[PDB]
């Protein structure tokens, strides 16, 4: 094929040949690396997250509970797992079931951090229809709405299922939820399952066990036995955990340990660890790993905690008590007198957002913002903090929009607005404007959706124009800025109107739950426990008999539950969930990759040759725009509006509007596919100025490709991706390639006029044919060596992993049958597909020695 082009007179420019060869070499090498699938995401490199993702993401059909505490990165961990599985080919179809109001947050996270475009399925967009899309997000309610729909989902042949906030799957002996039942049915037909929930087990042990049974109903079949085994385990594991903290062990703990591990002699290991010797610490970390292989929830549950990971800011509450204006006092009394009585909730909501009462009787569009002291306080705060990036949160979009107008007209400060009525692209623009340094918006006004999952590293100040109606929404608001890696303490300003539901609720959240300044896993439990009572205080804030006691009771419940949670921590599992030194090393290794000058040089040459225009902005960023004369009509991922790119991870994290270019980015992969599936650079001729060789000497640079045809799911690329084999032959068939390195030789060559070129080739066409014949014999030898080596490394690696899981099963009940059968079956189909591998000539460059 490539020789046919050359002789038909079709001669590419030399630089195209070099680009083609580099593209093959690079793509064949970036497939066989340990951190593959953990580079391309727009995230910081946090060890505990990478620990989970690298462990879970490389398994066959992962079935796990991701139970990290709030803010630790359960969404990011799920993303890295999906990213790895979809890049490697282990998965192709993914379903993500989330709570109703979280769909857009997930859609943006998957696309903007993992370059994965999920299709949103709801009833408005579609009143089976799931074969249409490979990546689907929908709500839990949507998925369980009808029995027809559920069965549609089960038969849609999903590879992986992700269920966010899985504590909504509630179970009971006599009436499990519809939610639970729906996931129970789906989990039987999807091989891989990720359940995400931070809910501590002490608040629902039974439901916790039910979720584990969704993952492995075979192993998790006896609630009582499971609890008993965990209870007997804690004594062992608590001590060992106190040893990784360096408090030496007893003689009691030493026989319990020798027994807990009867599969081998650990007397040396124990003698070391339980002593003040320089070999004591490593003896401890190894013991910890042995205990975790025997853990009851080993391999299935990952629970990192904020106490352990410790990268989170302090939270500081600043309340401002403001006088209640006569206009609102009047409206409250009028409503109590002339009021068509409403629900408890609706009266409370009226008292929490008093502008709603005022608008009811003065008509909507009444200028509440002209006398509401919260508005005046906000104007004052913002005009004296003009250089502070401030996140301002209201419950309702209409309130945020009304504030934007006031702030602009009365003080000339332009705020970005963020609410669910706006399109994704509209929120993208508002987000970029708020993130813009020095020239951008100083304020982001949000409805209850906050800032979704977008990072504003520079924002540490938050104003709650009003308060949310329940504690889950409160923590979600604070979680917009209380994020891992935020250095500056969060200042939470709460201006509130005295003698209203606002003052009641601010006191309840703060004094009852301590929910502002400390992350509160107790909030929902206490709220539901006192709901009726609290709602009446909110509905009648001027009738507060017994409120002081409610506060006292609620705080006592909060402290009691906090104590239970502290006492019930599995501190061994917490340590093991962070990943230790192996996880730190994995993060360090990925970061070493990041500084890849090869990729930057390759990508520029690639885009240039494809025909994409490149404008440099100086700030580690470049603007890419389509051109008239590009290799293809429309390059996927490239709009006529252009795209901003960066190759630097820290820039990409600060500029969420820019693409983060890595070997794993679709632009590179699409770019490689374009060049390598086509003719570009496959046929050329060059001159070599060299007087130490006879003039007219002919050299043929041959690039063969060795590749095995197989389904992507087999993941042959781990062992034999399409691999180039470069030969450099003379007339006698001597292959010089082993001692003539490609780059050094490539530099020594000269381009030649294409017309003069096609004349040189025709003059030596027959010599070339003979050389090509000599190459075919040598490629068979080379390809057979490459193939046999890969077939053997597949044997070694895959048999090694099957042995590792069989050895784990001897001590661990959580290794599943289908896991061992999957490795076994894959080791077989991989070896067979390689022994059908083939080769072909991909490119050639003729080289003619001159002396001139
Ligand atoms: N490694 C990371 N790099 C960048 N952003 C991160 C990282 N980890 C978490 N975040 C951000 O922190 C926020 C919380 O992440 P998330 O996974 O939703 O926490 P949760 O465990 O409560 O579900 C999100 O906005 C996410 O984008
Ligand atoms: Cl992988
Ligand atoms: Cl895929
Ligand atoms: Cl006032
Ligand atoms: Cl942020
Ligand atoms: Mg979450």
Swiss-Prot record:
ATP binds at residues 68-75. The keyword DNA-binding applies. GO terms for cellular component: cytoplasm. A motif (DEAH box) lies at residues 164-167. It is an enzyme of class 3 (hydrolase). Pfam families: Helicase_C, RapA_C, SNF2-rel_dom, Tudor_1_RapA, Tudor_RapA. PANTHER family: DNA ANNEALING HELICASE AND ENDONUCLEASE ZRANB3 FAMILY MEMBER, SWI_SNF-RELATED MATRIX-ASSOCIATED ACTIN-DEPENDENT REGULATOR OF CHROMATIN SUBFAMILY A-LIKE PROTEIN 1. Belongs to the SNF2/RAD54 helicase family. RapA subfamily. HAMAP family: Helicase_RapA (MF_01821). This is RNA polymerase-associated protein RapA. The lineage of its organism: Bacteria, Pseudomonadati, Pseudomonadota, Gammaproteobacteria, Enterobacterales.
